[PDB]
Design a protein around this nucleic acid. Sequence first.
DNA 1: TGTCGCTACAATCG
DNA 2: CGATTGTAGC
Length: 868
Amino acid sequence: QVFRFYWLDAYEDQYSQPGVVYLFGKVWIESADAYVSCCVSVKNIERTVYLLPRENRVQLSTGKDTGAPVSMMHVYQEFNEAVAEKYKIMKFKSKKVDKDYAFEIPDVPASSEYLEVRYSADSPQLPQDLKGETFSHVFGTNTSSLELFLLSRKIKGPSWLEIKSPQLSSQPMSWCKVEAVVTRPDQVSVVKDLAPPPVVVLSLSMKTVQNAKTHQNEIVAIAALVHHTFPLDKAPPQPPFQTHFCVLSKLNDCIFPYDYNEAVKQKNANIEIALTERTLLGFFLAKIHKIDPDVIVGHDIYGFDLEVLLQRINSCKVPFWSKIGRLRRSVMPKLGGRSGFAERNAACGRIICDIEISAKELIRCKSYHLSELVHQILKAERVVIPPENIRNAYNDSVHLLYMLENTWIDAKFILQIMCELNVLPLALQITNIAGNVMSRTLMGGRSERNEYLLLHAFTENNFIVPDKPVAAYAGGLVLEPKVGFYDKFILLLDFNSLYPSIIQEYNICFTTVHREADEIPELPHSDLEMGILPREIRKLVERRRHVKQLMKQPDLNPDLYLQYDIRQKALKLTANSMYGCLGFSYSRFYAKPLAALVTHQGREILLHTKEMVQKMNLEVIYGDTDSIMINTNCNNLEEVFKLGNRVKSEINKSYKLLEIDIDGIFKSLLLLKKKKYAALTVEPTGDGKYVTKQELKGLDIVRRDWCELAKQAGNYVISQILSDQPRDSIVENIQKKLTEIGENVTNGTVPITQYEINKALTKDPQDYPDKKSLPHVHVALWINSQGGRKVKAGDTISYVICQDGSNLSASQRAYAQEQLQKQENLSIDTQYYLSQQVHPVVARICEPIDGIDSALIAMWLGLDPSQF
DNA sequence: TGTCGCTACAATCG
DNA sequence: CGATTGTAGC
Ligand SMILES: Nc1nc2c(ncn2[C@H]2C[C@H](O)[C@@H](COP(=O)(O)OP(=O)(O)OP(=O)(O)O)O2)c(=O)[nH]1
Ligand SMILES: [Mg+2]
């Protein structure tokens, strides 16, 4: 009678169906010898409200204090007589519950007795500010049914569920294979210690041609790859895809090439030529229904792909739109709007993975468009078809098949990127750690994950969680650096998980820090038991430590090593975001005093460590909120390591959980400013043999907002400065290289690609005020004017500052590279680069170096020394 | 409909 | 000078 299934996504419609949540997942059907998508409707999720009684009765209007003691009997009588009649609530179940509370609502005791009241989700919702003669507050009035279910049944991310006495639906309500109705949340349980089942992953790439008549994007191809047994706890399979399907349509006026049919048949692929976009969309929807993918992946799926798909479905009136998801509906959610919430609801029951968001979360790249990710992750080159060539492709079989195969290659690259970053396993792991829904986790962001983590933690410890909400304080301390060049050994000491460690050691928690509704609250007494937040953050830190230790295993596959590094960084960021969300104004758990206390203790710790190291008769030259740089004044590495161990032990002696470890040994250092230095990190090889690896932090060479020519010049200069060559030879080599680069720029022998400057966007190009014209925004608008996919917020734009004869400011002469390659009146501003891209960077680098100055750099580049 | 924290340098505009 | 926008660093 039981019903065991693995739930992946949950969908709730607060308005359409009240108190009903649909869970989509996998169920093993023995006859089919495979898992099949199943949908479970958990109905009758009653809404719970906790009432906090007063100590004495109070007149509602007079604001008096009668003095009659208030017991739960009076609270129940009041709710039965006044509130129930006033708000039209017919049936409700009331019980007395002892619950704890430590959050930001004044006059709420730490522990007290509450009157938990439950009634049907169809009944009206009580106001958030409800008060009465017998109670001073009502909680959980606006709690979502999904949240109530998840916290009541202690479901934490995807996992196996056991359903008791399931019933069958009168008529189908989902596009899945198996359906079941649960009449009460009590019938759903969690079963642990079982492997996740393989899921279906469908990677789709589409090619569209815009109609300038109506500025609407029409789809002309959809190449999709599917794998039916993609694991969620193992390595990605090779090849990542099992089968595929391609659909190719024609425009409104154009016609197919002469022998398109014969060439397509000879191609031997699952190509379906759809006469009209209506048929193409119908075929795609039928294919999605047949495959029933659980994880649909793509690039810009949330911003471009799904929005275009739904818009064209609406325009062409393709009947069964809801097949894009897993529920049966009739009215499509309104498109547009911020985020992909409309798209997510349209694809309800299917986990949408946007490798753009995932890549932004996991790795750092100069640009996040598909070509850059392909070049960086897969080390492959992607061929991009201009939209004009897509329009002109419908004139010969060869070009049309090339376009379709390019769409296929884009889909394959998307799947390869998803597998390489290990996005799905990481999403599953983080969702299990946090306890929220997987789709939200893959949507990006750290606030919701931490919010659900703390919801689960506090709920399990008999706490009333706060209702969902309907440079403020000082931060880390950066020591003043001793700018210069150090050719001896610099020893870097860095704390491990400094803020998590502070929270653990000093017992900083909602239940221990006595706040008051900008003064730093006092530290909690050492007698108190560990709070909820220290426990959760300790678990996170321990998981990260386990991953790091697993990384140290010798003879590890480099790809597996990089995956472990990404996982460790993700766990570090999860703990740090747990810290940060204390200082988030819109967060559910805003506890600014706690964040201020954490940062204040961090500053105190750094100051104390600096004082200790200085008291050891050692030189301290830098430090950023958890670290110290020490000038050992030694040339032997063994002594450096011995001193590092000694000082680390001495510092650690003063703490219970905080630990200081040797971050790295720099053979040479070039400390320029705060958060700006270059070093030759030393990684010993064995038997006294060490290998030196360069390391730049914060310099302009490691910023996407500088031309690659400037980056190359600065890298060469830094390499020379950090080398062991005599100083005179270093200066001579710098002069020679600068002269060569000046000659190359003057003679136009530099590649054009080296002139690009990359700047991202924060708002849409339209939303930028008329603050003159920031270069990138300028080019951004041009890109939108032309007939191509638009550039939205958070999109990198590469522009080249070029001469146009305008006698205008450089910032107002920014142009796209294609513009330069096309127009005959635009030329690269050689002087601009030699004077404001190469000279500034090298001049900043060579400030602490004797023999090089701004005038000399200007002279060597062929420029005029006067102005500089 | 969501949206982690703060410190610091840098180029540009008013 | 101060304000903005952007990109690093913890
Ligand atoms: N809120 C927030 N705080 C951060 C972030 N990055 C660093 N911090 C803060 C909190 C960290 O405890 C502190 C020290 O920076 P680190 O980069 O050295 O990280 P941490 O020491 O926590 O760990 P680790 O050195 O990798 O063992 O800086 C972040 O992304 N968000
Ligand atoms: Mg650290």
